[PDB]
Structures are given as structure tokens and as C-alpha cells.
Symmetry: C5
Subunit: 47 residues, 5 copies
Amino acid sequence: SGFKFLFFSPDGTLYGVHNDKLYKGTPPTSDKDNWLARATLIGNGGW
Amino acid sequence: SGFKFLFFSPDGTLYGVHNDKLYKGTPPTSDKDNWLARATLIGNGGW
Amino acid sequence: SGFKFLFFSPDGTLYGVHNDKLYKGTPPTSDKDNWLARATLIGNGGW
Amino acid sequence: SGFKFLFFSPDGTLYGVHNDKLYKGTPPTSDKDNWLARATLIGNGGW
Amino acid sequence: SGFKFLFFSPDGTLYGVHNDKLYKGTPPTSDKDNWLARATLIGNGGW
Ligand SMILES: CC(=O)N[C@@H]1[C@@H](O)[C@H](O)[C@@H](CO)O[C@@H]1O
Ligand SMILES: CC(=O)N[C@@H]1[C@@H](O)[C@H](O)[C@@H](CO)O[C@@H]1O
Ligand SMILES: CC(=O)N[C@@H]1[C@@H](O)[C@H](O)[C@@H](CO)O[C@@H]1O
Ligand SMILES: CC(=O)N[C@@H]1[C@@H](O)[C@H](O)[C@@H](CO)O[C@@H]1O
Ligand SMILES: CC(=O)N[C@@H]1[C@@H](O)[C@H](O)[C@@H](CO)O[C@@H]1O
């Protein structure tokens, strides 16, 4: 399923909508980085 | 049904299309922030 | 119908694909702004 | 006849995926500009 | 199915989601460029 939206802010922060929730964080630089687990949850639903 | 589009302008304003309407505003400050309730309505339909 | 694509250029111009046509213009600032009626048509189809 | 992706690079170049091919070029400035006929094909398949 | 997302970071790095994996790299230079073969894998699943 994965993300519904996945996009950058002009400040370089990666944003994503995943299971109707909004997340942000620095983009991963390696495939061992569990991005979703460490991303900042900034929206609990509705996205 | 969530958003149809969700994207940034170059100055870091978040834009979104929700129920055919267009909204803009600073991005959510936390998961406590009801963005859609405070976003500026900039289009009533047709998006 | 609504837009198929709706996105910004780095100079802050809003671009949209609507009914296979490509449009650009300054983003709307209020819900009184009929954006599609004033946007510059820059592609008459195929988008 | 219908793009899959259509988006800007931060350097102002328009990118588009059309039928599994990737194209780039300066954005069109009028509806007389046949963009896809003059765009640089930078990817042939897999997009 | 090709890519699910395909988008730029603000410094001009191309990001893409392909078969649930996240890749980044300089954008394709020409159709001689096998982008997916040389892109950096930065996320293995979940995208
Ligand atoms: C699209 C939108 O604004 N969603 C928000 C959600 O992110 C936030 O967690 C909640 C707090 O009450 O309010 C809204 O539902
Ligand atoms: C896509 C578009 O330009 N929609 C606008 C809408 O946002 C605005 O509220 C209305 C004002 O009359 O005109 C148009 O319908
Ligand atoms: C996808 C694309 O390049 N479409 C263009 C269209 O925008 C333009 O109005 C027309 C002019 O002849 O040529 C092409 O159809
Ligand atoms: C998604 C991707 O990297 N596609 C490329 C394609 O654009 C390029 O023309 C071809 C060259 O052999 O290699 C790959 O298929
Ligand atoms: C959406 C997300 O954060 N996916 C990551 C994936 O990129 C990474 O390869 C994996 C490491 O085990 O962790 C998570 O699955």
C-alpha cells in the first residue's frame, strides 16, 4: 500500500501521507533507515 | 476521502485540494493542529 | 471534473492540467478568484 | 495524449512521463508551443 | 507499472518510488542513462 503522497518541502524536509496520517522528516540516506518509524507524526488523520 | 492534491509552494506554504476546494496555509505544527479547519480557503470548487 | 495535475514551478507560478489542457498563473488568494477563467492557457491538449 | 507525471525541477525545467518515456524541456509559453514535439527524450522505457 | 512517485528535492536530486522501493540520484542525462540501475537505493519496501 505504502504512501498516498510523498513530496518535499522547499526546505529539504520529506513529507508523506501514510494511512491517512501526515509525517515529515529528513529523507533517508540508506535503505537500513526505517523512515516511517522515526518520522515526526504531524497529523493523525483526514489526509 | 482525504486530499486529492497536497503540495508545497516554493516559499513553504502548504496547498491542498479537499472535496474539490483549494486550501493553503503554514504546514501543521503538530498532530494537535487541525490544519483543514484553519487553512485559508482560496477556492470554492472546481479543483 | 477538476484537475489532473496541480503543481508549482520554482518561481511560484501555479500550473494545472484541466480537461487535457495546460494552464499557468499566480495562485488564487481568495475564493472569489476564478483561477481557471484568468489563467494563461499554455497548452491546448494532450496533457 | 495524457501524462503519467508532470512536474518541475528546481532549476525550472519541466519534466513529464508520457507512455513510459521521460521528457524534459523549458515549459511552454503559449498554446502554440508543441512541447512534446520539442522536448528532450531523456528516458526510453521503464518510467 | 513503472514508477509510483517521481519528484525532485530542492537541490535538484531526483527521487522515485519503484516496486515499493525508494531511489534517488542525479536526473537522467539522456536515454543512454539507465537511471534505475545507477540510482541509490534509499528505502527497501513500504513506499
Ligand atoms: C487534514 C487535517 O487537517 N487533519 C487533522 C489531523 O492531522 C489532526 O491530527 C487533527 C487534530 O484534531 O485535526 C485534523 O483532523
Ligand atoms: C478551478 C477554479 O478556478 N475554481 C474557481 C473557484 O475556486 C472559485 O471559488 C470560483 C469563484 O467564482 O471560481 C472558480 O470555480
Ligand atoms: C502535450 C503537448 O505538448 N501538447 C501540445 C499542446 O499543448 C499545444 O497546444 C499544441 C500546439 O500545436 O501542440 C501539442 O498538442
Ligand atoms: C526507469 C529507467 O531507468 N529507465 C531507463 C531508460 O530511461 C533508459 O532509456 C534505458 C537505457 O538502456 O535504461 C532504463 O530502462
Ligand atoms: C516506508 C519506510 O520507512 N520503509 C523503510 C524501508 O525504506 C527500509 O528499507 C526498511 C529497513 O528495514 O525500513 C522500513 O521498511
